[PDB]
Amino acid sequence: MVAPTLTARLYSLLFRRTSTFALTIVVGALFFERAFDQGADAIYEHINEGKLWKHIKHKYENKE
Amino acid sequence: ANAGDFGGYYCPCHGSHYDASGRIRKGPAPLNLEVPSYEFTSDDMVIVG
Amino acid sequence: SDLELHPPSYPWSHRGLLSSLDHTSIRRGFQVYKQVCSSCHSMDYVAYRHLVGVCYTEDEAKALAEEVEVQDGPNEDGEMFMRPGKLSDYFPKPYPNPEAARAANNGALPPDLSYIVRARHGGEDYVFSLLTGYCEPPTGVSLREGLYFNPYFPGQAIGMAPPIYNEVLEFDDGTPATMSQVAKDVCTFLRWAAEPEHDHRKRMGLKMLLMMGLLLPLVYAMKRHKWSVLKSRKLAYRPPK
Amino acid sequence: MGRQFGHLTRVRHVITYSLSPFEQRAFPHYFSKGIPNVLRRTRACILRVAPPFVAFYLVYTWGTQEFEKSKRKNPAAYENDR
Amino acid sequence: MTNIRKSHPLMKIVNNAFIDLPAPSNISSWWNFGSLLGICLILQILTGLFLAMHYTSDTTTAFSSVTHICRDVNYGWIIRYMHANGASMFFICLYMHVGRGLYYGSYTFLETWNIGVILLLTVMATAFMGYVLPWGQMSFWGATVITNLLSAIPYIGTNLVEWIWGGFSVDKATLTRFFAFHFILPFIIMAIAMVHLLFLHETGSNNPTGISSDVDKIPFHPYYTIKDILGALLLILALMLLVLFAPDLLGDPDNYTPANPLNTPPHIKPEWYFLFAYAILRSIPNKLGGVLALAFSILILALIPLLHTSKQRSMMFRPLSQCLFWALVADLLTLTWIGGQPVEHPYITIGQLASVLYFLLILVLMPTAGTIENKLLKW
Amino acid sequence: MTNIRKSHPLMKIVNNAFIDLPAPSNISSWWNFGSLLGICLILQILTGLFLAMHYTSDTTTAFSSVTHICRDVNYGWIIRYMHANGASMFFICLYMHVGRGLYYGSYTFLETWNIGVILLLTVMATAFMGYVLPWGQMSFWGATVITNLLSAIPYIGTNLVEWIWGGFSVDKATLTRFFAFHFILPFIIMAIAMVHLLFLHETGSNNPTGISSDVDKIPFHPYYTIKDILGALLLILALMLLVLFAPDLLGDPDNYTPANPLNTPPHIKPEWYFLFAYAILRSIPNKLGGVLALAFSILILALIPLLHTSKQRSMMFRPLSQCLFWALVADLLTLTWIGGQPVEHPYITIGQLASVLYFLLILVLMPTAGTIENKLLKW
Amino acid sequence: MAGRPAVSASSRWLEGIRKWYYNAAGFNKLGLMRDDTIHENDDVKEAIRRLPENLYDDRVFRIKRALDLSMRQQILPKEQWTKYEEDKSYLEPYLKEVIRERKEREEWAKK
Amino acid sequence: SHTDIKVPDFSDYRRPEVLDSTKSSKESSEARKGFSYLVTATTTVGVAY
Amino acid sequence: MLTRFLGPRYRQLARNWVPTASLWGAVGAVGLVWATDWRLILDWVPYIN
Ligand code: HEC
């Protein structure tokens, strides 16, 4: 957090004005929530590989 | 039940006359009568959807 | 006998904090219910539509439902009439009233299997041990007719003929229908029939841990940052003369 | 509610200094002195906290042991024999 | 900061108690339970209201409606379990709120403390009727033994029990009354809680030191709102850990079978937060003595402020009283352990000894502890 | 020890608003409806709670439980009718509370008046939701027509109509939700009513004269408490007259047949206190216009304080506005009369004219009335 | 409490236990005298109002810094603790007079 | 005698960049406040989810 | 009761307010009896027998 650092541009560009502070909170929530679900779900499938319905659904509905 | 004039169906509360297909002949009704989705698998059974 | 035996803690595919149910076992677990349990055990809280997306497809479950006839209320002439079941229909009740059930058996009333996993101490571990725990009564114990010895059952005398044996049914996928294997599948099914939310329970649990594991250090930082003014605060007493 | 800053008490000849929260580290010497602090705090209270709860475990480890012994049958088969 | 703020005759000044209220700086973490209790209260109302949109009080369709909530309602399974495990968090937070007052001498606020006992009684009453709502062989029988305790009262005991029951025993008449009563009582708690704060803002908080903190008060808004928010998350983390990883860890398994008046569960017991009260009642063979001791133990809180002896106020500088305080907490845990166990020979002796010690400590040992230290400090 | 300095560091200081509050001496009887409204809330909650101890929200046993209340419960028949007629007395008292503000310019209390509209909206929501509880072919069908009005909202109508319904139509899912919602909302009204007074006691009350009464204020306790008690009895007499001598005089007879979705009632209509709004909606053949006019007529109260023109506050010395005020009251009665009549050729013409006059009077004629008199009084 | 200094000790002398209890109480570790931790009732509060300005101002800072120590959950260094022998009652003379005044006032309304 | 007052040493808690008395504090002001607000922005993002 | 200490002034205070406290308990007795028609008590009054 020093002379030419990422956070210095991060504060001035966005956090300097409270109006743009809320924008990154709502826009950041959009991109965080989309990545977090896919990120957290993909772990669940790895823990339960070959367990849930979607891992054995291909065995039916004319696919097998 | 079938006690109508121009289609057999009348609305006894405020007044709305429908034809065989449900077209509004009178009454302050904005939209025509509902028509469900049509599909068939057997000639003796129907599914409303 | 009137004595208690602690069920063993059998490892399960869903015993972990994030482990989910094995839906392949659920499909085989239902086959035990529709062939063995349903003869004299009821499940009146699970529908044929619940198996859709869990162990059977929509077309598979519709075929299962239509395989059994059920009642469809009053006819146009005000009379009962049979009809093939639908997805919305619950599992068939073997008997109309509990009095008939006590008449079918030797007075014992078969408990509902919808919550029997969560309505018994030990959960599926006790049920699995109860199904496979049958043994010859020890010397000095006399059992009346219609009573069988099961140590895992409280009282050690249960009104249950052994319901599971080797090759009692045949599984669709071809797994051997052994005494222990069949009990494992129905125990897996009886858990799903009791806690259908089991998979989503852990799915949101993992999301919480990742979500809260990140917010808790962050929220702590805001607390420390606001309170860092008072923590680093020096007091000086400078009275006159 | 009839009480606020201004009339709370009479404070005289006391000077305080403080820093801006942005000019100081939020987590300064966390494990350098916080960990030796918690050891100091725990010792100051372990002689008044632990003994009351240590006794409860002793009750637990004996009250439960006797209960199983009661449920266990005792060899009192004499006086009947064959 | 924008203007002279003008105005002011509105409800904002009532909110100065949340922003500009003076508060001690050295307020420890044992104090978020005040705000946590408010979080718990509005959480029960939020989840309870949505539960009441699918729950039907008739016995023929009471238990089956609870199953319909979990099995059919979208996301209805979680709401039931944050409600069931929230009451566990409510009484977890409730017992530390009482414990802090015992340790830090907060009962010297006689008005606030007395209203606090009333708040405690209201929640324990509210949580009792809620347990009867699912109607699950622990609801029916748990309510059977507790309500039948009122039959020990003379000349009104039989009359009021039927009046409470709405008949000759717990039945559909009792179940409908409980659901209606369970709906209104939490809104009474909100009103009393506002009254509870009204008797505290006159005198402020109670620093763990126990001395007056008027010399070192700090604004509430920038320091304790962020401290309570962190405390709220630790509550949500603890509550959600039960709901999402062990929803039935605290509840008894026998509650999942429909209530049957002809069948008795193998062990009949109330929820874990009433277990300590059950142990005291079961410690006396007499029926009239047991109900009185059950009520006296809960109502002994109002007698605590009249038992103060020490010239100091908080137990911070009272090592002799500190040893007794954790003996009482350990004994209260022994009472909880005893309550969940059947009445046999190892527990009748332990149960009677723990109960006789529970009253002996507060009534005799603690006041004698304060007197002894007064001699040791030359005052 | 100062008798005047009473137990002040308690809740009595708040109660000084009931005893030592300065009030105008020339307060007429039309002010009594403020205290009557509070009694109506307390009466409705008292009878409501005891009704909720026997009412079951399930469709299969909703109507049959109402019959069981009257037929079986001891003295349960009266409680059902003081609830059914208390709502009639509520809206009788509610409409005069609004009318007095219109006549005496009490809407100049902008904070109190705006909270008053919020209070009005909450009660009409509660009354509408409670009418569906008996489930009697007027409950099912009265809720059917009114709730279906939300389908006219563009691009979100059907989305929220089903979200209100909990399904594709009014059914058991909607019935359980209403009973839970009908239980919670009245306790919200108590909180808002306390806020309603909080925005009024700061600015005092109003007088029929309309001038400031600070020169002739009198204590509330010995003069208005006994004036409100007499006003309360006149309310109890009027409410009990309906309950004991004509319990079904206001309620429609068709409500006594169980709800049948396959059969429609001969005439569909809400309760008498919504009939004035039914006529306005029925005036416009358009669907989106009708729902907007229904909401605008109720929400036009918030627009009244922005339409004041006369330099005098009350209508006491405004004869031109007095002629218009009773024209509006008469027109509001015409809307009530025509609301309960079927939509035929005589009531189609009269319905449109009464509705177009209802908005024309307040929006145009009344502000023009104040301007004319302002010129007529050299100012 | 902990093992008494002598060997283990049940109850030896009187000054030894009082000295042992003073360190056990732990208000010296915060730089507070004995009368800086007393309960402020309607009696003690008046007896505080009679304190001399130099003594009252000293009490304010001792309390002020103690709350700072309690806020950080810290204690003063080993050399800055209040010595038991050096502890003196700066409030006992003022309390006694208010005791005397209140007893006389109460007994005057009794006789 | 008021000139005898001297602000104590805060270097124990001081951020590393404002540790040097010679270097101006305005160079890192944007980033010192940027890091602190980054914590707040990331906390609200998590709470918003 | 109705006093603060044990003295002649308070003893006179207690005695002076005994007749009012004497008849105040009648309201608690009769009023409670009136509320629930205490039979054992209502069986002795001649007119209400
Ligand atoms: C012969 C008819 C019959 C069969 C087939 C049957 N049950 Fe039962 N079941 C009963 C009866 C009768 C009881 C009650 C026994 C008693 O209470 O003594 C019972 C009780 C139970 C219990 C309750 C045990 C307890 O301690 O409460 C469980 C669990 C159970 N059955 C599971 C099963 C399972 C799993 C199957 C399929 C393998 C099955 N049953 C098949 C008749 C049957």
Ligand code: HEM
């Ligand atoms: C302080 C407030 C409250 C407390 C402590 C409380 C406590 C409880 C408890 C312990 C249960 C038992 C649940 C179980 O064991 O399965 C319960 C059930 C229930 N409560 Fe409450 N409750 C409170 C407020 C409310 C409110 C305000 C409502 C409705 C508006 C409500 C509605 C219900 C319902 C419908 C049930 C039965 C459904 C179920 O058990 O899941 N509760 N409550």
Ligand code: HEM
């Ligand atoms: C729903 C129940 C309750 C709620 C919502 C509630 C709320 C609160 C809150 C928010 C505070 C101030 C927070 C704080 O000072 O830490 C407080 C203070 C207090 N409450 Fe309660 N409380 C409840 C029940 C109780 C109970 C069971 C007691 C039992 C003794 C109690 C006694 C006290 C006392 C003594 C204080 C003084 C705090 C102080 O010393 O500063 N309250 N209450």
Ligand code: HEM
């Ligand atoms: C301002 C408050 C309230 C208003 C204006 C109101 C209004 C109404 C109305 C108009 C009905 C229709 C009765 C009929 O037409 O037969 C009704 C029914 C009912 N209300 Fe309310 N209500 C209020 C509060 C409450 C409360 C607080 C409860 C419960 C605690 C309650 C419980 C019921 C029940 C159970 C019914 C159905 C029984 C019956 O209709 O006789 N109400 N209410």
Ligand code: HEM
């Ligand atoms: C349950 C509903 C309500 C309750 C309990 C309530 C209660 C009260 C009370 C007790 C007063 C003072 C009594 C008086 O000054 O005569 C008052 C004043 C007032 N209320 Fe309400 N009110 C309710 C609804 C409304 C409504 C529907 C309006 C519509 C405009 C309203 C607007 C006002 C106004 C303008 C005053 C001014 C009184 C004055 O000028 O002296 N309130 N309210």
Ligand code: FES
């Ligand atoms: S005629 Fe009844 S709604 Fe149209």
